[PDB]
Design an enzyme around this catalytic site. Structure first.
Site, mmCIF file in Angstrom:
data_model
loop_
_atom_site.group_PDB
_atom_site.id
_atom_site.type_symbol
_atom_site.label_atom_id
_atom_site.label_comp_id
_atom_site.label_asym_id
_atom_site.label_seq_id
_atom_site.Cartn_x
_atom_site.Cartn_y
_atom_site.Cartn_z
ATOM 1 C CG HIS A 25 22.705 -22.207 -36.246
ATOM 2 N ND1 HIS A 25 22.271 -21.277 -37.171
ATOM 3 C CD2 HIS A 25 23.006 -21.531 -35.123
ATOM 4 C CE1 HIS A 25 22.334 -20.089 -36.621
ATOM 5 N NE2 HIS A 25 22.760 -20.220 -35.383
ATOM 6 C CG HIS A 64 19.439 -22.494 -33.464
ATOM 7 N ND1 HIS A 64 18.649 -22.322 -32.347
ATOM 8 C CD2 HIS A 64 20.226 -23.567 -33.227
ATOM 9 C CE1 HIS A 64 18.975 -23.246 -31.463
ATOM 10 N NE2 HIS A 64 19.925 -24.017 -31.971
ATOM 11 N N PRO A 113 13.624 -16.421 -32.832
ATOM 12 C CG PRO A 113 12.518 -14.420 -33.129
ATOM 13 C CD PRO A 113 12.615 -15.804 -33.705
ATOM 14 C CG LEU A 114 16.405 -19.154 -28.824
ATOM 15 C CD1 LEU A 114 17.716 -18.913 -28.097
ATOM 16 C CD2 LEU A 114 16.296 -20.634 -29.161
ATOM 17 C CG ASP A 153 19.670 -27.061 -23.244
ATOM 18 O OD1 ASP A 153 18.906 -27.831 -22.591
ATOM 19 O OD2 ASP A 153 20.731 -27.415 -23.774
ATOM 20 C CG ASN A 183 22.143 -30.074 -26.969
ATOM 21 O OD1 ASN A 183 22.175 -29.219 -26.076
ATOM 22 N ND2 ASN A 183 21.894 -29.786 -28.242
ATOM 23 C CB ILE A 185 25.978 -27.834 -25.893
ATOM 24 C CG1 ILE A 185 26.985 -28.863 -25.370
ATOM 25 C CG2 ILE A 185 26.660 -26.793 -26.769
ATOM 26 C CD1 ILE A 185 28.210 -28.294 -24.635
ATOM 27 C CG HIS A 259 24.983 -23.178 -31.305
ATOM 28 N ND1 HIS A 259 23.653 -23.478 -31.175
ATOM 29 C CD2 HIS A 259 25.034 -21.881 -31.690
ATOM 30 C CE1 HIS A 259 22.938 -22.405 -31.444
ATOM 31 N NE2 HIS A 259 23.752 -21.417 -31.754
ATOM 32 C CG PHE A 440 1.777 -3.886 -18.282
ATOM 33 C CD1 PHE A 440 3.038 -3.334 -17.994
ATOM 34 C CD2 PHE A 440 0.729 -3.623 -17.424
ATOM 35 C CE1 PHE A 440 3.214 -2.536 -16.891
ATOM 36 C CE2 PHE A 440 0.921 -2.836 -16.299
ATOM 37 C CZ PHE A 440 2.164 -2.288 -16.045
ATOM 38 N NE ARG A 523 -9.002 3.424 -14.353
ATOM 39 C CZ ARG A 523 -9.178 4.087 -13.220
ATOM 40 N NH1 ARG A 523 -9.095 5.406 -13.155
ATOM 41 N NH2 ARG A 523 -9.454 3.412 -12.119
#
Ligand SMILES: Cc1ncc(C[n+]2csc(CCOP(=O)(O)OP(=O)(O)O)c2C)c(N)n1
Ligand SMILES: Cc1ncc(C[n+]2csc(CCOP(=O)(O)OP(=O)(O)O)c2C)c(N)n1
Ligand SMILES: O=C[C@H](O)[C@H](O)COP(=O)(O)O
Ligand SMILES: O=C[C@H](O)[C@H](O)COP(=O)(O)O
Ligand SMILES: [Ca+2]
Ligand SMILES: [Ca+2]
Lengths: 675, 675
Positions: A25, A64, A113-114, A153, A183, A185, A259, A440, A523
């Site tokens: 990238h 990246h 991982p974004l 982004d 940027n 993009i 990119h 969760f 519980r």
């Protein structure tokens, strides 16, 4: 100027790395090189001591773009070289396609991982604030470092970053300085197609300070000034908007095509010539750039040298705190800390393992200062706060102080998971935890997986583990959850049956240095078991009830161990002799010697597993599996157990069928394999 | 007034339901009863026809407040009664502790996991806009309905709601009207401890319209007016801030203690007396309330009757669109739609299954109008857009139109998953899909699990399934992911090996009415297999290579089927005869007859599984398992396969060891069990 030459050097190292790999990238590295240059010039760090506790931290959330990070680390003389850059994205190299903290010197966390890295930065900053509040004294700024994060982004679109940014604003984390690569993009093209929100207005709504740099392709003076401005705002995290051109300089600048794929060879030639480099040369490092960067390293090393003298003076003036701090920096828990773990006998009352967990925390938090943790808005349900302790809050709120030990994460499981990773990444022996319902924890899978890959000793206090929770029903009752995490490499998944096992689970979780823990807790009340101990449960799996003439062994976890013991008695009336194995952590068990494991799960006897959720994985330890492979139900918990035949009689029936199924067959341990 | 009496009735039904169960959540029902009354009075719905396609939809995103929803449904004469309310939270009742669309008439979606419902509402609204754009004509408002959502602080903290709200604002979804229960109380107490952001400023930053109702405990006139105002803003979703008191009326109003436990008996008595009810009576339904609600139902039924006549007139004026719409409302796909599925032979070129997926979509999208879908910013990587199609965007942007078929989700996997659930929930036979990398489906686990529990036929186009993706490395390479989803009830997890199997996977995904699908697809090219067909692959598992004198059967999926076939040839040189089974979907296979399954996995022969990720689950189908139970690596994909010995020789070695391990042993099918 040398600064211009440095920026070009960074840009071209990154592009040449991508070119050599024919993968990766180049766009964001080209766009962020000026900012990277400016930030690293402001940062205090030692390339020869990556663990200096008062270093500024840098996190590349847009992972990246790691050719950029690797280029900075190489230029600054970390344990990463141009030869490593030439091996970018090649099997076994020190320059993997996304940064890995286990592999890459100077990579604080693992990104790719974004959304994760910004949250990790929130956790590093949270830890720094807590650490500084714990140790700093007048004339002793033991901790005063900053946390710098780059993000794009994509990170801003991922919900986890919203969670962490809301919380960071609430927590007034003024030493966090994030930089948005504005940027416009992403992979699908212009952000106009999917991401038209007013990001700056959103960050103001969280209580962040904003600085905007309109020409971040060239204006390093303004980037530096933005950092200075951010440092003056001590009660708000800052977002610096860097308006850049993706792929700046490329023929294909400003496009999605830059990119994530290598540039064309002719494009790289024109980059070099217009920046004054030789288009025939790759991986150039002008000696003037090295010299300039070395000057900054030498200054930073003098700063660290002075910090070491400050620390020595601190130990003289504050002997107890100084010894505590030294011990933590050495990575050692307090001597005999584990003597605080509660111990139980079969004569003691039944207790839910969530309540046993509360009791453990109550005993160990006062003994082990590096334990901090919180809950995702389930404090009175998870039972994760020790009575008397103070919440981690900015004192300005009146609700806590930064010296506090208990974090109100709000309804933010995913960010809690990634923040825990950042607290671990800070270092100083932090042993940190986060509570939610087991079902969760799945909201946070993106971060949990990274705890495992990053080798961080974080702990999930994951209560309400099964249909035993009752009326909240199938949207709350785990089925797949333990299988998911047990199938992930490097996750210890403890499901303690009783008080002694719960103490063993915490002993493992707190002693951990490289393995995240999930503690699956009930519980509902469970009895204290005859035969349990911290010693035996520390082995991960152990023989609870030994039967030398066993017709069957029942292996179980958690709430189902007591069920198995009751089934043994039903079986005795049917003329069937059973043993019982408790398997509180499959990973810990797996790590024991072959001979130990075979002593628990021997050849020559059928083995039935019992656990009220998925049967996946259980064939490692059993011949037949009694589990729950459908969703649950909304009703009183004992009625749900009865419905699904998780009763002493139901277990006994299946055990008897198992014995019959193996009549006349030769049976070897499930631990045996062909390869 | 009757409106005051209705609100009290709702409040007291909810409290009495919680009281009867001695379990559940009275606080938000008490606070939201005025808003529920006002909203349902504005809504068009038929309690006797829950599937009327032009109904307004209601979603309770704060699903713990379901005693409120159930009370509304009872009062309006849905197929839910006071006797059902008396069985709130009891095993097998129609009033489970969180709403379940499969079980509860009038529950559009399944909520309880916070954040999901608002996103589902975004999907219902997205579908309505797409549907209206497809079918409405001048004088024919076939679709003009609204989507009403209640949500709380918890939903607003969960990152998934931020994702969906950003996207909904971008998409200008003016028929979405959400209501924030602004009561400043969560489980941990005041929102001041964790949630101090300016929510309204954040929603403005997304492009939402705002209406604030400062006294939502009493001011139903203002709530009604807020709805009217929202309806006038046709190009923005609206958030209505309802400032309420949690537990309004209770002695314990305004406290966390009223969130999630039954009220005290004396508290319930004083509620009744101050609202003019009998404190000795429970589950009271004043006949005047029934009458008033029945008037609104009768008016709504006349509206539906007129809609039916509009639809008949539509079919006359627009015969083709009318027949298409009728077919969709009947739940039927186009006759012989599946003849569009591509078919391959062993003579055809190798193709990545991501590209085969693109080709399938290219063929079936023009044939099946109810297919819509998108990608989470991975369109050119997942290959999820058919060339020529138009994106779903508001026409005002110039980037698409609401008649479009392709959704730019941005980097928002979790919201994409929950939005897909909402599109499915809309109805009209929508068969919708969402692309990302398989490893990042995990970001969306909260929603994926709900697809399974809710029985929605959504499809994940989950490319880059393994170490075969190569250089992006271990942060991107699934290990645990298929085990996680296969361990979840009711998920079809297709991992097609070739062109014919990819067409079978889509046939299953599109024909589905009650089972979500995940299609695990490759980055890298795979050969067309000798022996594959749509017919055989439709069985989920099938004999690819039959060997009547087999020494071993190798069962494999996806990219590992070709590997198994190559291993068969190596084994032949070692004097070992192998068969090969392809298992493209374990769920579909499991659903076949016992005899069919035994024809594929017979007794009397060792069976080895091969799949380059977790071995969990595989013992259902095999005696020995060759998988990958550690994280991956960053390098060229073929080199990673070689490193981990996923080669013809490596498979053959393990197959030979398996044959040797079973020499002199009696072997029965893995499909056999004791119970
Ligand atoms: C959780 C997650 N989802 C998806 C991806 C795939 N992905 C890689 S980069 C990217 C988006 C690129 O946009 P941005 O972050 O703005 O980077 P830039 O275009 O500026 O390089 C995506 C969707 C990922 N790495 N992580
Ligand atoms: C994803 C998820 N995490 C945690 C919970 C547990 N939980 C139930 S309600 C709630 C928060 C209550 O706050 P709010 O949504 O504001 O409800 P109110 O207090 O107004 O009733 C939490 C954390 C859940 N149901 N879903
Ligand atoms: O952001 C990284 C890459 O551009 C992205 O993962 C896409 O990878 P691909 O080259 O497999 O499409
Ligand atoms: O929101 C629902 C309940 O208050 C919540 O799930 C807590 O449940 P508990 O009663 O098990 O603590
Ligand atoms: Ca970008
Ligand atoms: Ca609330």
């Amino acid at each position: 100027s040398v600064d211009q030459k440095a920026i070009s050097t960074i840009r071209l190292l990154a592009v040449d790395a991508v070119a050599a790999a024919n993968s990766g990238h180049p766009g964001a590295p080209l766009g962020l090189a000026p900012a990277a240059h400016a930030v690293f010039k402001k940062m205090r760090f030692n390339p020869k001591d990556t663990k200096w506790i008062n270093r500024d931290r840098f996190v590349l959330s847009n992972g990246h773009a790691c050719a950029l990070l690797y280029s900075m680390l190489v230029l600054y003389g970390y344990d990463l070289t141009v030869e490593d850059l030439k091996k970018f994205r090649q099997l076994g190299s020190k320059t993997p396609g996304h940064p890995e903290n286990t592999d890459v010197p100077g990579a604080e966390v693992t990104t790719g991982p974004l959304g994760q890295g910004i949250c990790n930065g929130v956790g590093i900053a949270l830890a720094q604030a807590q650490f500084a509040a714990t140790y700093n004294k007048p004339d002793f700024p033991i901790s005063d470092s900053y946390t710098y994060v780059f993000l794009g982004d994509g990170c801003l679109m991922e919900g986890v970053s919203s969670e962490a940014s809301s919380l960071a604003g609430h927590l007034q984390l003024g030493n966090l300085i994030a930089f948005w690569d504005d940027n416009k993009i992403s992979i699908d093209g212009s952000t106009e197609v999917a991401f038209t929100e007013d990001v700056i207005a959103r960050y103001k709504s969280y209580g962040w300070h904003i600085v905007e740099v309109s020409d971040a392709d060239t204006d390093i003076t303004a980037i530096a000034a933005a950092i200075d401005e951010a440092k003056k705002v001590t009660n708000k995290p800052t977002l610096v908007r860097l308006t850049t051109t993706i792929g700046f300089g490329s023929l294909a600048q400003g496009t999605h095509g830059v990119h994530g794929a290598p540039l064309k060879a002719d494009d790289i030639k024109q980059l070099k010539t217009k920046w004054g480099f030789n288009p025939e040369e790759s991986f150039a490092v002008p000696a003037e750039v090295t010299a300039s960067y070395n000057e900054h390293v030498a200054e930073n090393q003098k700063i660290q040298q002075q910090w070491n003298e400050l620390f020595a003076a601190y130990k003289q003036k504050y002997p107890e705190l100084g010894a505590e701090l030294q011990r933590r920096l050495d990575g050692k828990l307090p001597e005999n800390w584990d003597k605080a773990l509660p111990v139980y006998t079969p004569a003691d009352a039944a207790v839910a393992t969530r309540k046993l967990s509360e009791i453990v925390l109550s005993k160990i938090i006062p003994e082990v200062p590096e334990i901090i943790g919180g809950s995702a808005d389930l404090t009175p349900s998870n039972l994760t706060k020790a009575k008397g302790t103070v919440d981690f809050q900015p004192a300005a709120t009146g609700l806590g102080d930064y010296s506090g030990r208990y974090i109100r994460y709000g309804v933010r499981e995913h960010a809690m998971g990634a923040i825990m990773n950042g607290i671990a990444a800070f270092g100083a022996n932090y042993k940190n935890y986060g509570g939610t319902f087991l079902n969760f924890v799945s909201y946070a899978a993106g971060a949990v997986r990274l705890s495992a890959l990053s080798e961080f000793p974080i702990t999930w206090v994951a209560t309400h583990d099964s249909i035993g929770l009752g009326e909240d029903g199938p949207t709350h009752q785990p089925i797949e959850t333990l299988a998911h995490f047990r199938a992930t490499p490097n996750i210890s998944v403890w499901r303690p049956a009783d008080g002694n096992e719960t103490s063993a689970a915490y002993k493992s979780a707190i002693e951990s240095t490289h393995t995240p823990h999930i503690l699956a807790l009930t519980r509902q009340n469970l009895p204290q078991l005859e035969g349990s101990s911290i010693e035996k449960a520390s082995k991960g799996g152990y023989t609870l009830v030994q039967q030398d003439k066993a017709d069957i062994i029942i292996v179980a976890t958690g709430s189902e161990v007591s069920l198995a013991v009751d089934a043994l008695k039903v079986l005795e009336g049917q003329g069937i002799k059973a043993g019982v194995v408790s398997l509180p952590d499959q990973l810990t068990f797996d790590k024991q010697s072959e001979e130990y494991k075979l002593s628990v799960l021997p050849d020559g006897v059928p083995i039935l597993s019992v656990e009220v959720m998925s049967t996946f994985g259980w064939s490692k330890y059993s011949h037949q599996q009694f589990g729950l492979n459908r969703f649950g139900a909304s009703g009183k918990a004992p009625e749900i157990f009865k419905l699904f035949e998780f009763t002493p009689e139901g277990v006994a029936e299946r055990a008897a069928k198992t014995v019959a199924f193996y009549k006349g067959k030769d049976v070897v341990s499930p631990l045996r394999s062909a390869f």
